[PDB]
Amino acid sequence: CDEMVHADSKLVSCRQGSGNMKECVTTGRALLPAVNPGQEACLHFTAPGSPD
Amino acid sequence: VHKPGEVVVSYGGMRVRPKCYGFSRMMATMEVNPPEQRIGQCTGCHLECIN
Amino acid sequence: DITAIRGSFSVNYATCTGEVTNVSGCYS
Amino acid sequence: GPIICAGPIHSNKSAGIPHLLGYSEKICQIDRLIHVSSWLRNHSQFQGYVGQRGGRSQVSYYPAENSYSRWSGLLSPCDADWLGMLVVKKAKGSDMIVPGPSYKGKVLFERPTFDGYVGWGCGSGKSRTESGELCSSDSGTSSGLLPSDRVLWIGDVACQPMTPIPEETFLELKSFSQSEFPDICKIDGIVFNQCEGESLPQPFDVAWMDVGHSHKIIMREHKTKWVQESSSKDF
Amino acid sequence: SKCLKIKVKRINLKCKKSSSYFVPDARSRCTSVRRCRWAGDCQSGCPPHFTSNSFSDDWAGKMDRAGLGFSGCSDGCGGAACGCFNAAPSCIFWRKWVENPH
Ligand SMILES: *[C@@H]1O[C@H](CO)[C@@H](O[C@@H]2O[C@H](CO)[C@@H](O[C@H]3O[C@H](CO)[C@@H](O)[C@H](O)[C@@H]3O)[C@H](O)[C@H]2NC(C)=O)[C@H](O)[C@H]1NC(C)=O
């Protein structure tokens, strides 16, 4: 997917239910362009937590 | 018996036969966050040419 | 511009290499 | 109307009914509230004939309306204990009441808690004509019948057989439970989230279900599905 | 003798406020209550009147996340495959929520 824009890292609602696996919740809306047909588009996400 | 039947519970792409399903008033707790803040800071002020 | 609306999500939380190999060809 | 049986009235207060194993026979006993009395005899150590002409049809609830009450085939958590499908416990000293219902002339009631269910009774003669913790002595107990004055129930809760599920499914729903309610962290001393200090008492209500773990699965966004099927128990 | 002073700072273009309005972030959500015929004594003819602020079918009294979501009868499946032990159409009621997550 040559077309993709990352998520927004400011909307964060994470509860540390498990120490190994952080639990997070996010909402909002998305604004991405559209391709000329015949491919698969992606959408990447981040977190203030570093690894995942 | 005068029973409506069985309850299938679907929740976020799930399917559940419950033990006991209900809705009732309950004692919960509510949290509060402090609202607002302010600041000041040093600034350099100088002049070089006036037209 | 295909776009989406975001509800209350459920999204939750290494050793690697270079692992590179060959290329195919097309531009423009 | 009545399920199978309009149980008779017994005048002798000392009515000793032992354990019974028949599936169909015990239903009229619940219609006679024999299990309701047995909780009093087991825990309040008081033997009293309950539901004289009362039955299930005259049991009152804090909400004025219950369609499921009209459906007598629905099992209640109190009646699930005669079959032993769940557990009920004594009113702990750490428990504080919800000021919803009016407690006048009351003896026994129920409470759906986030961990389980609990029964509340006190002395014979000592009637709860007030919403307070104690119950003052009253002569209204002289007669053997209180027509659901000693009995009141909380919530319109449904109960049915359950097939077990792995706890990781219970865990993700528990994770899903926190997602839909960022505004709570503590429930009755049982931790629900982790945040700053919180005010202890709040009248608060959300739909919930039981699946067989220490925590309840709550929802404000679910959907129901009712089906009828052949089951030997429902006969 | 006494005096009063008036300071002037800027020249700018703004205008009056006629009335103030607020708009949250509406988000679609919904629940359906699935009811078989003869269970709950479904209205074989759906009544045009609806108690949309109570929902006597489901918890006549409760605070909701909803801006008074409307309800409608719908023609569900009927038969053993539908599990309603009857060929009559099912009896499904519904509710709308208008809510703001954040
Ligand atoms: C109050 O305490 C009573 C004494 O424990 C108790 O009666 C007992 O109930 C159990 C039910 O499990 C009976 O156990 C027998 O019967 C069941 C099914 O009927 C079997 O599965 C068991 O294996 C066992 O054979 C006891 O026999 C019975 N005790 C007496 C003396 O009848 C009441 O149920 C208690 N009531 C409350 C409200 O707590």
TrEMBL record, chain B:
It is found in: Host Golgi apparatus membrane; Host endoplasmic reticulum membrane; Virion membrane. It comes from the Viruses. Belongs to the phlebovirus envelope glycoprotein family. This is Envelopment polyprotein. It comes from Dabie bandavirus (Severe fever with thrombocytopenia virus).
From TrEMBL, chain C:
This is Envelopment polyprotein. Belongs to the phlebovirus envelope glycoprotein family. The lineage of its organism: Viruses, Riboviria, Orthornavirae, Negarnaviricota, Polyploviricotina. It is found in: Host Golgi apparatus membrane; Host endoplasmic reticulum membrane; Virion membrane.
TrEMBL record, chain E:
It is found in: Host Golgi apparatus membrane; Host endoplasmic reticulum membrane; Virion membrane. It comes from the Viruses. Disulfide bonds join C36-C84, C42-C91, C46-C73, C77-C82. Belongs to the phlebovirus envelope glycoprotein family. This is Envelopment polyprotein. It comes from Dabie bandavirus.
